[PDB]
Design a protein around this ligand. Structure first.
Ligand SMILES: Nc1ccn([C@H]2C[C@H](OP(=O)(O)OC[C@H]3O[C@@H](n4cnc5c(=O)[nH]c(N)nc54)C[C@@H]3O)[C@@H](CO)O2)c(=O)n1
Ligand SMILES: Nc1ccn([C@H]2C[C@H](OP(=O)(O)OC[C@H]3O[C@@H](n4cnc5c(=O)[nH]c(N)nc54)C[C@@H]3O)[C@@H](CO)O2)c(=O)n1
Lengths: 124, 124
């Protein structure tokens, strides 16, 4: 029942802060957004920009996704982000991560449904 | 089962003709599009324009729907349409309709989803 859109927010959005505020940022976040749930998600990026600016990325530079597909977009400007990487001593269920702050262009895959008619209201 | 959008085409789309052929048009189309199957749909409009053109309406003048919701759109140009309205003699299962040809702006309710981010691909 979770939309994919809401899934992206949960896994990658953190606009309440301008940067990761401590080396334990990833340990905290990866667990609170349920990314250690059934195993330790090894690589995850959190973005510290308004939801609007992130969403706007879908109207910026179209690039190929790293898996070949074409619905990826690269931000024209750098954004404050946090790289989360599972360390060499992590092991489910005690997931452990290294936290790295960065300012990079983000690249995202975007999806939607073009608006189509679904009901004839009236003619005028 | 049938999508809202597929049902809209079934009920209202007839790009294969540029206007109602005769006064029996509605009696025939209401039957073939199954709008008389279990009951007589009372009023129904068919649009004689390309699918491209009708769908582009969702990008045109936004207006309020007859029911108050705000996702209705009105075509900028008038379009060729046929009004199908039940006659006083229409009694299920012998649905009967009056065919009226016209050129007016159509108003339809549109649906879809904003193109938003759904996966984080990479940083660069
Ligand atoms: N515990 C670890 C630690 C490191 N690794 C690998 C992956 C690392 O490459 P990256 O390019 O950092 O990241 C790999 C790709 O991931 C991508 N990436 C970045 N952020 C995300 C994200 O949020 N989701 C996602 N699906 N992929 C992401 C971009 C890169 O192509 C590599 C070198 O450090 O070692 C690992 O396998 N297990
Ligand atoms: N059997 C009959 C015969 C005549 N009428 C009325 C409706 C006519 O006014 P309209 O403005 O066409 O009003 C019609 C309204 O119907 C609506 N409409 C039109 N086409 C459709 C459609 O495809 N679906 C839908 N749900 N509503 C439609 C919007 C229009 O304002 C009026 C005068 O002929 O008599 C009737 O109500 N029942």
């Amino acid at each position: 029942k979770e939309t994919a859109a809401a899934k992206f927010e949960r896994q990658h959005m953190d606009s309440s802060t301008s940067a990761a505020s401590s080396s334990n940022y990833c340990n905290q976040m990866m667990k609170s957004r349920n990314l250690t749930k059934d195993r330790c998600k090894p690589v995850n990026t959190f973005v510290h920009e308004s939801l609007a600016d992130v969403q706007a990325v879908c109207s910026q530079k179209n690039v190929a996704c790293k898996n070949g597909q074409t619905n990826c977009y690269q931000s024209y400007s750098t954004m404050s982000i946090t790289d989360c990487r599972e360390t060499g001593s992590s092991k489910y269920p005690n997931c452990a991560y290294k936290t790295t702050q960065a300012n990079k262009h983000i690249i995202v895959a975007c999806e939607g449904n073009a608006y189509v008619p679904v009901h004839f209201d009236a003619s005028v």
